[PDB]
């Protein structure tokens, strides 16, 4: 719910900067001279930054020493049709790159195989100024690398077409992460109204980073491998470590956990990594079922939780939810719901982005207002 707090920034500023540096007099001739010998070379740009440079396709050699000699020899009469197909090869890549840049206005968000092949991408990763752990991590998950990297068409002149592939760096690696799932927590009285609802708004990803916690509210903008969490530090807030205390005790004085108050008695289901939370309120049918045995649990009104072991499906009203069948250990921490600690007459009926101290203090405000009469 905290996706609005993030700051905005330019994503391709680095690639565009390298492009503006590639328009200087002599920088493309520098790169061409560097690649005159081999197909890969480290070049110190006029901007100070040293970049790896690849020659992914050589058409000048083929066209000028294999096609033009045979074509314009006597009367351009060709004798074999395998030349046509041999030229359809080695040319499809350029056409597809042109089409990809034309449809995306010169900047593509996932780096395709046409932009950079897996062999070329691995060769580029292995010769990068990064540690061997980062090299291994990038080499094992090339698909996530392509998803989180750009390709900015840079310049075309001096018989050379250049585009800058802007790759992630993955500076922070192997630090512990944890996801926080939330669901509405309401009271279960039978009246149609006067039913207070409380929710936690800090849902999303959390990772330890330089003594602080990088928190990602938009958990959808985070890819997950077997147990590795690829996130973008730009889609993140930076919080103190004490925020984790919001799990061990939610009324602690050190950190103030952001919450949300409402009066909407709506049944919902939130599927976590290894199980499902069910907020069953009203007259809604809430069900936990196994694939081979049918319904195995009927939920009573309130906020409950089931593990993914033996439970394969959670039904709420007419909505069906398939639970993740990922292996792990689940734990049920019994405790009294916090919502039973507030007065329904003094409870703030509406506050989107609030906290424990803010809501608790506003309760003092309203109670002082009522007591004065």
């Amino acid at each position, epitope marked *: 719910f905290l996706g609005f707090l993030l700051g905005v920034g330019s994503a391709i500023a680095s690639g565009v900067a390298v492009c503006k540096v590639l328009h200087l007099e002599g920088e493309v001739n520098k790169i061409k001279s560097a690649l005159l010998s081999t197909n890969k070379a480290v070049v110190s740009l006029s901007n100070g930054v040293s970049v790896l440079t690849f020659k992914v396709l050589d058409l000048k050699n083929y066209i000028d020493k294999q096609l033009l000699p045979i074509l314009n020899k006597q009367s351009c009469s060709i004798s074999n049709i395998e030349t046509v197909i041999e030229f359809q090869q080695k040319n499809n890549r350029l056409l597809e790159i042109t089409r990809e840049f034309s449809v995306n206005a010169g900047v593509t968000t996932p780096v395709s195989t046409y932009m950079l092949t897996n062999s070329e991408l691995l060769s580029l990763i292995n010769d990068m100024p990064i540690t061997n752990d980062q090299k291994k991590l990038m080499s094992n998950n090339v698909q996530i690398v392509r998803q989180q990297s750009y390709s900015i068409m840079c310049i075309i002149k001096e018989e050379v077409l250049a585009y800058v592939v802007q790759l992630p760096l993955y500076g922070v690696i192997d630090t512990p992460c944890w996801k926080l799932h939330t669901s509405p927590l309401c009271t279960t009285n039978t009246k149609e109204g006067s039913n207070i609802c409380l929710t936690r708004t800090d849902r999303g990803w959390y990772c330890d980073n330089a003594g602080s916690v990088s928190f990602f509210p938009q958990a959808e903008t985070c890819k997950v491998q077997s147990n590795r969490v690829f996130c973008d530090t730009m889609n993140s807030l930076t919080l103190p470590s004490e925020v984790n205390l919001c799990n061990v005790d939610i009324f602690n004085p050190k950190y103030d956990c952001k919450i949300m108050t409402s009066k909407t008695d709506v049944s919902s289901s939130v599927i976590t990594s290894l199980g499902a939370i069910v907020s069953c309120y009203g007259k809604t049918k809430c069900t936990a079922s196994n694939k*081979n*045995r049918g319904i195995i649990k009927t939920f009573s009104n309130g906020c409950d939780y089931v593990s993914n072991k033996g439970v394969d499906t959670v039904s709420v009203g007419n909505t069906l939810y398939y639970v993740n069948k990922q*292996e792990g250990k689940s734990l049920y921490v019994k405790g009294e719901p916090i919502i039973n600690f507030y007065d329904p007459l003094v409870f703030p009926s509406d506050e989107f982005d609030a906290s424990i101290s803010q809501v608790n203090e506003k309760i003092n405000q309203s109670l002082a207002f009522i007591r004065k009469s």
Partner: antibody
Amino acid sequence: VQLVESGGGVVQPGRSLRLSCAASGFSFSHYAMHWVRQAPGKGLEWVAVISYDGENTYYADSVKGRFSISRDNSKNTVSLQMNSLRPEDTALYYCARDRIVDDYYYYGMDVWGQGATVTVSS
Amino acid sequence: DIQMTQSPSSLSASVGDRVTITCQASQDIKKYLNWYHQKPGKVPELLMHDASNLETGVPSRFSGRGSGTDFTLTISSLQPEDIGTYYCQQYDNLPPLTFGGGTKVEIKR
């Protein structure tokens, strides 16, 4: 697919005995494992079961408190330790695979081993 | 726990006869029942699960019917390799998985 069982023999009443059963040919770490005995000439008797992770063990009423089931997924083995043996425990014991994989509800046995004979007679 | 009874204790039929054996439970096991066939001196082989779902490789002459408390296993044409013992076993909701008393099947003398 193969389940090789060992540890059978003759044991005087009241003593202990441990049966083992090794698996090969399937992903043993994801199947619940059953122990089922059969008296000579009589029918089949369910003895015990253990889930895929090994954190859920169920015993028959006639062997509750005496037998104990355990598993080891690094070597693909299931062990049934039977102490304080009565003469009614003399039977042939099979280790069997649960038909349905990766579940906490046990359904039935589709792959049976050859068995180990256990005689209790004094 | 749930008690299971098979009928008949034994039967003797010629090759090709239609054989129908019955299994009954003390309470509702609605469809959580398997049928096993133990050949003489062999391991028990799973014939079918869910009281009607034939296991792959089992000859189509075997047919399972029934629900609730009563189930039937039927062989349309009894064969030589069909002799032995037949066991019904319930798996209703969190073991003990009780078996049945078994049914002996032999070819005529």
